[PDB]
Design an enzyme around this catalytic site. Sequence first.
Site, PDB file in Angstrom:
ATOM      1  N   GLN A  14      21.906  -4.072 -20.366  1.00  0.00           N
ATOM      2  CA  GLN A  14      22.510  -5.231 -19.695  1.00  0.00           C
ATOM      3  C   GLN A  14      23.514  -6.004 -20.577  1.00  0.00           C
ATOM      4  O   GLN A  14      24.305  -6.778 -20.079  1.00  0.00           O
ATOM      5  CB  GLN A  14      21.428  -6.155 -19.163  1.00  0.00           C
ATOM      6  CG  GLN A  14      20.710  -6.953 -20.214  1.00  0.00           C
ATOM      7  CD  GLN A  14      19.584  -7.770 -19.620  1.00  0.00           C
ATOM      8  OE1 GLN A  14      18.521  -7.250 -19.215  1.00  0.00           O
ATOM      9  NE2 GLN A  14      19.800  -9.063 -19.570  1.00  0.00           N
ATOM     10  N   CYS A  38      19.013  -8.967 -15.712  1.00  0.00           N
ATOM     11  CA  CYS A  38      17.761  -8.205 -15.664  1.00  0.00           C
ATOM     12  C   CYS A  38      17.178  -8.110 -14.256  1.00  0.00           C
ATOM     13  O   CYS A  38      16.601  -7.102 -13.878  1.00  0.00           O
ATOM     14  CB  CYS A  38      16.739  -8.813 -16.629  1.00  0.00           C
ATOM     15  SG  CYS A  38      16.424 -10.525 -16.387  1.00  0.00           S
ATOM     16  N   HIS A  88      12.016 -12.758 -17.452  1.00  0.00           N
ATOM     17  CA  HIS A  88      12.766 -11.535 -17.612  1.00  0.00           C
ATOM     18  C   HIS A  88      12.321 -10.504 -16.591  1.00  0.00           C
ATOM     19  O   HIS A  88      11.170 -10.126 -16.579  1.00  0.00           O
ATOM     20  CB  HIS A  88      12.542 -11.024 -19.037  1.00  0.00           C
ATOM     21  CG  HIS A  88      13.318  -9.791 -19.370  1.00  0.00           C
ATOM     22  ND1 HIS A  88      14.681  -9.705 -19.216  1.00  0.00           N
ATOM     23  CD2 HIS A  88      12.920  -8.604 -19.873  1.00  0.00           C
ATOM     24  CE1 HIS A  88      15.087  -8.509 -19.595  1.00  0.00           C
ATOM     25  NE2 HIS A  88      14.037  -7.823 -19.999  1.00  0.00           N
ATOM     26  N   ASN A 138      12.561  -1.521 -19.348  1.00  0.00           N
ATOM     27  CA  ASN A 138      13.405  -2.661 -19.628  1.00  0.00           C
ATOM     28  C   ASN A 138      14.890  -2.268 -19.435  1.00  0.00           C
ATOM     29  O   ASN A 138      15.178  -1.103 -19.116  1.00  0.00           O
ATOM     30  CB  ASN A 138      13.084  -3.132 -21.049  1.00  0.00           C
ATOM     31  CG  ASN A 138      13.591  -4.515 -21.354  1.00  0.00           C
ATOM     32  OD1 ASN A 138      14.032  -5.247 -20.465  1.00  0.00           O
ATOM     33  ND2 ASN A 138      13.530  -4.891 -22.644  1.00  0.00           N
TER      34      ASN A 138
HETATM   35  C1  LIG Z   1      17.809 -10.250 -21.474  1.00  0.00           C
HETATM   36  O1  LIG Z   1      17.063 -10.562 -20.335  1.00  0.00           O
HETATM   37  C2  LIG Z   1      17.157 -11.860 -20.018  1.00  0.00           C
HETATM   38  C3  LIG Z   1      16.106 -12.756 -20.219  1.00  0.00           C
HETATM   39  C4  LIG Z   1      16.288 -14.103 -19.884  1.00  0.00           C
HETATM   40  C5  LIG Z   1      17.536 -14.530 -19.402  1.00  0.00           C
HETATM   41  N1  LIG Z   1      17.696 -15.811 -18.986  1.00  0.00           N
HETATM   42  C6  LIG Z   1      18.695 -16.123 -17.971  1.00  0.00           C
HETATM   43  C7  LIG Z   1      18.483 -15.254 -16.713  1.00  0.00           C
HETATM   44  N2  LIG Z   1      17.244 -15.531 -15.990  1.00  0.00           N
HETATM   45  C8  LIG Z   1      16.735 -14.722 -15.039  1.00  0.00           C
HETATM   46  O2  LIG Z   1      17.257 -13.680 -14.659  1.00  0.00           O
HETATM   47  C9  LIG Z   1      15.472 -15.151 -14.343  1.00  0.00           C
HETATM   48  C10 LIG Z   1      14.382 -14.087 -14.450  1.00  0.00           C
HETATM   49  C11 LIG Z   1      13.515 -13.899 -13.196  1.00  0.00           C
HETATM   50  C12 LIG Z   1      13.205 -12.421 -12.985  1.00  0.00           C
HETATM   51  C13 LIG Z   1      11.709 -12.141 -12.985  1.00  0.00           C
HETATM   52  C14 LIG Z   1      10.979 -13.003 -11.964  1.00  0.00           C
HETATM   53  C15 LIG Z   1      11.329 -14.480 -12.114  1.00  0.00           C
HETATM   54  C16 LIG Z   1      12.242 -14.741 -13.306  1.00  0.00           C
HETATM   55  N3  LIG Z   1      15.875 -15.352 -12.972  1.00  0.00           N
HETATM   56  C17 LIG Z   1      16.469 -16.469 -12.515  1.00  0.00           C
HETATM   57  N4  LIG Z   1      16.744 -17.568 -13.262  1.00  0.00           N
HETATM   58  C18 LIG Z   1      17.340 -18.457 -12.412  1.00  0.00           C
HETATM   59  C19 LIG Z   1      17.841 -19.742 -12.551  1.00  0.00           C
HETATM   60  C20 LIG Z   1      18.380 -20.372 -11.429  1.00  0.00           C
HETATM   61  C21 LIG Z   1      18.449 -19.728 -10.187  1.00  0.00           C
HETATM   62  C22 LIG Z   1      17.956 -18.442 -10.048  1.00  0.00           C
HETATM   63  C23 LIG Z   1      17.405 -17.843 -11.168  1.00  0.00           C
HETATM   64  O3  LIG Z   1      16.847 -16.560 -11.212  1.00  0.00           O
HETATM   65  C24 LIG Z   1      18.572 -13.597 -19.225  1.00  0.00           C
HETATM   66  C25 LIG Z   1      18.376 -12.265 -19.537  1.00  0.00           C
END
Ligand SMILES: COc1ccc(NCCNC(=O)[C@H](CC2CCCCC2)Nc2nc3ccccc3o2)cc1
Length: 220
Positions: free
Chosen positions: A22, A28, A167, A187
């Site tokens: 990614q 993710c 994640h 992953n």
């Molecule tokens: C490298 O992998 C990552 C790990 C963390 C991040 N943080 C930013 C992206 N966040 C995410 O992808 C989380 C993960 C999601 C998937 C699993 C079930 C529930 C949680 N999803 C997410 N965050 C949001 C904030 C506002 C609105 C919608 C959102 O959806 C980005 C990439």
Amino acid sequence: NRILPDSVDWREKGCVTEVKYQGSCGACWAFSAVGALEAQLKLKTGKLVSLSAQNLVDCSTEKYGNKGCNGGFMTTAFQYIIDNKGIDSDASYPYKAMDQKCQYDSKYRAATCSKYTELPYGREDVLKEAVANKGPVSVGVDARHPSFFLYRSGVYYEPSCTQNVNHGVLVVGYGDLNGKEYWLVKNSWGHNFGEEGYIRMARNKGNHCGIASFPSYPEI
Ligand SMILES: COc1ccc(NCCNC(=O)[C@H](CC2CCCCC2)Nc2nc3ccccc3o2)cc1
């Protein structure tokens, strides 16, 4: 516990595509979603085809509560695929690890989705059943802890893990390695991460890292 195989690995059934990378885009959730659908597509059509994570990043956007490289949901990504009446192949709509304008084209459609199912919160028995009977399941895990990034082998158990998941990943199987039950997780940080892009995470250890908190799977 339900009557089910002691171990499952959907890679052995040709239902899991190559591990993706990614990069510095938080997509993710889109990798997790397409991974789940990839398996169902193979089960339904006999063909294993990587689906376009980029298509979700670019197209399952505000309407689905998603924010591209800044996060989204696997379930609402499935709903987008339903509403949109398809998703393009990865080859046709490649991943650029950035937010782009929606470029979906049905001429490049490689899968459909008719529905999705969200599994009950925290139930590892139900997750086991789904992984055994339905296919790989999209889940979220708490991947914030330094130990996660540095995982190399064995079964990942981190005392500091929480059920606050951050994640999106894909459960492609489960089993027991040296007396430690695990979930086999694909992953999306490339082959460099973990065991060729996979991590075995602790199973039946109190919904460790929230692995069974928010599981879902699509159907074609
Ligand atoms: C490298 O992998 C990552 C790990 C963390 C991040 N943080 C930013 C992206 N966040 C995410 O992808 C989380 C993960 C999601 C998937 C699993 C079930 C529930 C949680 N999803 C997410 N965050 C949001 C904030 C506002 C609105 C919608 C959102 O959806 C980005 C990439």
